[PDB]
Amino acid sequence: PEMVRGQVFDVGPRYTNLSYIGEGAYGMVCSAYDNLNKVRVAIKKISPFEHQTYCQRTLREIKILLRFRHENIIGINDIIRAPTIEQMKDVYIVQDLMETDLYKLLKTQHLSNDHICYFLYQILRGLKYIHSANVLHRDLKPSNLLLNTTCDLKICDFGLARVADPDHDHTGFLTEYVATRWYRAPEIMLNSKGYTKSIDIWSVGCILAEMLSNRPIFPGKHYLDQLNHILGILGSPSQEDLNCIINLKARNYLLSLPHKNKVPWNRLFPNADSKALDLLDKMLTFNPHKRIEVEQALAHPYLEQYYDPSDEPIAEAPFLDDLPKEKLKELIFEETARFQ
Ligand SMILES: N=[N+]=NC[C@H]1O[C@@H](n2c(SCCC(=O)NCCN)nc3c(N)ncnc32)[C@H](O)[C@@H]1O
């Protein structure tokens, strides 16, 4: 079994001529030649079996990605693993090879307004499908948006995704949260568990702002600092928006702050298309109930060159968290059986 950059990458004999790409937490990504389809693919090695949390995210990702089928969501082409649970120590997920991701692209490339518009359209088109399945991605950010050489965009990494649960979204002030800090909606720090679709629209708004300037709009350095970056741009919430926050600790925190004025988007982004900034404002709205929804965003004048709801498909049907890692390995084994 051939090796890569230290350890075993046991994918053969269908996949050959491996090249290292990157790493994450418990596994590395390589590119490889698919000897059957005769194209290079991406292969991600996943070693999650010692931890409930890793098994949980792996199962979530596999289950969701196998059920979804959409041009703007990464597919699972194949899954390689041992024939028996006993022998299964790793799982390899084979996906389309994508040249880059939006994080890498934004580090070095200025985006034309035409690219920004196209990228945003594709993000929202994929998100419409995810939300139509009653799923929340919950970790949208540039590094989870893959791009190929012709700039087709695919959303990836569903390891933090959940089924939407708006009736149980409420929580207290300063409740711990897992998803990436800079893309967190203000309500996460105030009174929300991130169980409603508006959590993802906020993240997309952050991504749009970052495409406009190649810099994160709200780069907080720690949990509450994230909220002060948001408020430093949006300004103080209105009385109406405060009244929607019944939790007294969260409301009184906001009332304790000195008044802050809104920074006009066109001062922050003086070269941006005015229609893009109108949509940005609607995505980055403080009150999550007033925030634009995915289907409204697709219909926004900024996206008129691409909008076509008949070509923006939805899921054919909509889609726990306290299971021992043992049942989870069995579940991963079962979920991946179709590829044997
Ligand atoms: N892990 N790792 N190492 C990252 C490297 O692996 C590349 N990478 C991926 S992982 C993308 C999701 C991810 O890790 N997001 C970080 C926050 N969750 N999928 C690829 C694919 N399908 N084709 C080509 N490269 C692919 C990624 O772009 C980078 O180069």
Instruction: From 148, 75, 155, select the one nearest 105 (Cα to Cα).
Output: 148
Which is the closest atom of ligand 1 to the Cα of 96?
22
| Residues of each domain in the chain carrying CATH 1.10.510.10 | 98-321
- Is residue 159 within 8 A of residue 59, CB to CB? The reply is no
Helix (H) or strand (E) holding 20: strand 15-23
| Residues of each domain in the chain carrying CATH 3.30.200.20 | 1-97+322-340
- Is residue 108 within 8 A of residue 96, CB to CB? The reply is no
- Is residue 331 within 8 A of residue 59, CB to CB? The reply is yes
Active site residues: 139
Superfamily (CATH) of domain 98-321: Transferase(Phosphotransferase) domain 1 (1.10.510.10)
Query: CA-CA distances (angstroms) from residue 81 to 36, 92, 158, 219?
Result: 18, 6, 20, 39
Q: 286: number of CA atoms within 13 Å, CB side?
A: 22
Pick the CATH number of 1-97+322-340 from 3.40.190.10, 3.40.50.2300, 3.30.56.10, 3.30.200.20: 3.30.200.20
Which is the closest atom of ligand 1 to the Cα of 95?
22
Binding residues for ATP: 21-29, 44
**Which tokens in the block code for residue 102?**
């939006």
Cα–ligand 1 centroid distance for 286 (angstroms) = 31
Task: Using the Cα atoms of residue 43, residue 44, residue 50 and residue 55 in order, give the sign of their dihedral.
Answer: negative
- Is residue 105 within 8 A of residue 153, CB to CB? The reply is no
Quote the CA–CA distance of 74 and 152 in Å, as a whole number: 11
Query: CA-CA distances (angstroms) from residue 115 to 20, 52, 106, 123, 173?
Result: 29, 40, 12, 12, 39
Residues 6+ apart with CB under 8 A from 133: 67, 68, 314, 315, 317, 318, 319
Quote the CA–CA distance of 64 and 80 in Å, as a whole number: 18
Q: Which amino acid is at 1?
A: P
Q: How was this structure determined?
A: X-ray
Ligand 1 proximity of 159 Cβ (cutoff 6 Å) = no
Ligand 1 proximity of 101 Cβ (cutoff 6 Å) = yes
Resolution in A: 1.5
DSSP string, 42-61: EEEEE--TT-HHHHHHHHHH
DSSP string, 124-190: HHHHHHHHHTTEE-----GGGEEE-TT--EEE---TT-EE--GGG-B--TT----S-GGG--HHHHH
- Is residue 1 within 8 A of residue 8, CB to CB? The reply is yes
Residue whose Cα lies nearest atom 11 of ligand 1: it is 144
Beta bridge partners of 65: none
Q: Tell me, what DSSP letter sits at residue 261?
A: P
Q: 56: number of CA atoms within 13 Å, CB side?
A: 11
- Is residue 153 within 8 A of residue 72, CB to CB? The reply is yes
DSSP string, 51-107: -HHHHHHHHHHHHHHHH---TTB----EEE--SSTTT---EEEEEE--SEEHHHHHH
